[PDB]
Ligand binder design. Structure first.
Ligand SMILES: CCCCC[C@H](CC(=O)NO)C(=O)N[C@H](C(=O)N1CCC[C@H]1CO)C(C)C
Ligand SMILES: CCCCC[C@H](CC(=O)NO)C(=O)N[C@H](C(=O)N1CCC[C@H]1CO)C(C)C
Ligand SMILES: [Zn+2]
Ligand SMILES: [Zn+2]
Lengths: 167, 167
């Protein structure tokens, strides 16, 4: 497992739409997943998307005080995700992104989503998530469609540097 | 002349509306202006607004390859500015802000503005500016009404970190 560089906002690769994975359970795919977990763990992230390490594929991983009611979710590998948003209940919360280092912003997310897809072995995944779990999945899914969380912000008075917002 | 700390985005003082200066040509006002120029010069800025150093007053200073056609404008102190925007001609250009370190974004500005106000001696100032000159004045004026340039951005695909946007 190797630590890969995380691309920063401004890199046009973060704006592309990731392509689907076609072949499952390959040594190449296991290596990518392992590299992503090493990279995520090293930066103390709750999730990571393959475009963030320069891999333009529909692969996300996740697993983990601002959300003290959140149960722990075991590490998950989600490939070719299909999300279903569940209107109308939205929640505001603070987000940061490893591709936007040093900053936080308030982002509205669906309180609940369904997500499905496949793990790196090609096994089906199908879950309903709420709260922080749902927020992490939405944040990582956004990375696969070229969206970073400042694109989701509507109140830029609540966007700024972590050191100043939370001293 | 002393160098003051520049407040970073997230500090609620940058969102306040600055109060007008009431007394001109005082030792206190000259000291502020001197501190602002020392702070601006030190960060290699083209302008600075008093709220950026924690002074909630309508004081801006400015003076100075992305705008190679721009003539030099001598240092200016502008107090209680009154801007007139001149529609319809707008220009896009890259901006950075000392209160948003490490980032750049594309911002639409009026190509031309009129600005008036007073210098630190109480002498009237009244000018028409275009191009980069007009852009700097708009950027600094925004600081006095609680606006930072990410609030002006409409295309967040052209917002990111300088090191990545301009390597
Ligand atoms: C919350 C939605 C974002 C989850 C994923 C991000 C990591 C990332 O950039 N994924 O693409 C993260 O862990 N962000 C963390 C984050 O935002 N946290 C961690 C705890 C609470 C919240 C900050 O309010 C920190 C490490 C920046
Ligand atoms: C252009 C509108 C902004 C002018 C004022 C800012 C400084 C500032 O934050 N004032 O409040 C500046 O000098 N910004 C510079 C800036 O944006 N420049 C300098 C040359 C060209 C342009 C970058 O595209 C750098 C130092 C960040
Ligand atoms: Zn992220
Ligand atoms: Zn500025």
């Amino acid at each position: 497992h190797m630590i890969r560089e995380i691309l920063k906002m401004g890199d046009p690769r973060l704006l592309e739409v990731a392509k689907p994975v076609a072949q499952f359970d390959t040594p190449e795919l296991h290596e990518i997943v392992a590299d992503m977990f090493e990279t995520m763990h090293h930066a103390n992230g709750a999730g990571l998307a393959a475009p963030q390490i320069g891999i333009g594929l529909q692969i996300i991983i996740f697993g983990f005080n601002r959300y003290p009611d959140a149960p722990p979710v075991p590490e998950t590998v989600l490939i070719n995700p299909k999300l279903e948003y569940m209107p109308p209940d939205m929640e505001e919360g603070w987000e940061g992104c490893l591709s936007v280092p040093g900053m936080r912003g308030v982002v509205s997310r669906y309180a609940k989503v369904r997500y499905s897809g496949y793990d790196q072995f090609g096994a089906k995944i199908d879950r309903v998530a709420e709260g922080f779990h749902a927020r992490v999945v939405q944040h990582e899914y956004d990375h696969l469609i070229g969206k970073l969380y400042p694109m989701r912000i509507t109140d830029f008075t609540r966007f700024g540097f972590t050191e100043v917002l939370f001293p």
